[PDB]
Design a binder for this molecule. Structure first.
Ligand SMILES: N#CC[C@H](C1CCCC1)n1cc(-c2ncnc3[nH]ccc23)cn1
Length: 267
């Protein structure tokens, strides 16, 4: 019943293209502006492509990108709501980046924690939480997207710089490894989109994180916010905070934690 006829869709503008398929902005039933994830016909199994839609069928939250429809016969289409400002990573790196200060950045973080706390409640794992997988809409609304690797808890290698070591090394993906990634996401926000562990290659990152290395407090980031990051990067997955706590901490941040915050030059 999520099924629609393919002639119901008009693809128009390209927005991006991954190496397992493409993403277009389109029109649904001639009335609704949508986004249409397409498949590169041969890159990966059609059933592997559709599992992303399988997952999105079960999830529904204001801070997760919403599934609209599916075409499950080749060529395959996953149809979702359209996000007008593109990826958070591009937004932070773009011309808006320099004007964002801590209050807009923390509010973006709160929204992401809200969507993820919902994922937490439903017993899903995302497994690719990072700023390139968050989408920005009107009024600085942020929604988590790309549930390509997401699954209910019962590829070959993951971006180690965002992945909790137990998950990178032994495949132990839990909501607490998503919490690890959220901490790394917090450093992307507070540095306006810089790659984590500047100057370190993947192996060096792995070796040092095992030996206890953690990224320092970014310039102008408050120590209370870097404390939060460090709790997210606790070696013991179960010492890591929940998203429910993270959501509430970030929504209340400027009253309960940093009530005397003054804007600086970049944050
Ligand atoms: N690679 C490429 C995939 C791309 C990544 C960006 C966030 C999720 C993955 N992606 C963007 C979308 C999308 N969905 C809805 N509105 C949008 N606007 C711009 C991109 C976009 C879906 N996937």
């Amino acid at each position: 019943a999520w099924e629609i006829p393919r002639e119901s869709l008009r693809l128009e503008v390209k927005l991006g293209q991954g190496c397992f398929g493409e993403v277009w902005m389109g029109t649904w039933n001639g009335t609704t502006r949508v986004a249409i994830k397409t498949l590169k016909p041969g890159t990966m199994s059609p059933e592997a492509f559709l599992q992303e839609a399988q997952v999105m069928k079960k999830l529904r939250h204001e801070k997760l990108v919403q599934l609209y429809a599916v075409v499950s016969e080749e060529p395959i289409y996953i149809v979702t709501e359209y996000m007008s400002k593109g990826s958070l990573l591009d937004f932070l790196k773009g011309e808006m980046g320099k004007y964002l200060r801590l209050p807009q950045l923390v509010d973006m973080a709160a929204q992401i924690a809200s969507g993820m706390a919902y994922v937490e409640r439903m017993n899903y794992v995302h497994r690719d939480l990072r700023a390139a997988n968050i989408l920005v809409g009107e009024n600085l609304v942020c929604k988590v997207a790309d549930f390509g690797l997401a699954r209910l808890i019962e590829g070959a290698k993951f971006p180690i710089k965002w992945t909790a070591p137990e998950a990178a090394l032994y495949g132990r993906f839990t909501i607490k490894s998503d919490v690890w990634s959220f901490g790394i996401l917090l450093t992307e926000l507070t540095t306006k989109g810089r790659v984590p562990y500047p100057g370190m290659v993947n192996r060096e990152v792995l070796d040092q994180v095992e030996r206890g290395y953690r990224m320092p407090c970014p310039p102008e980031c408050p120590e209370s916010l870097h404390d939060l990051m460090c709790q997210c990067w606790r070696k013991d997955p179960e010492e890591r905070p929940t998203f429910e706590y993270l959501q509430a901490f970030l929504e209340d941040y400027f009253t309960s934690t940093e009530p005397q915050y003054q804007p600086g030059e970049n944050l």
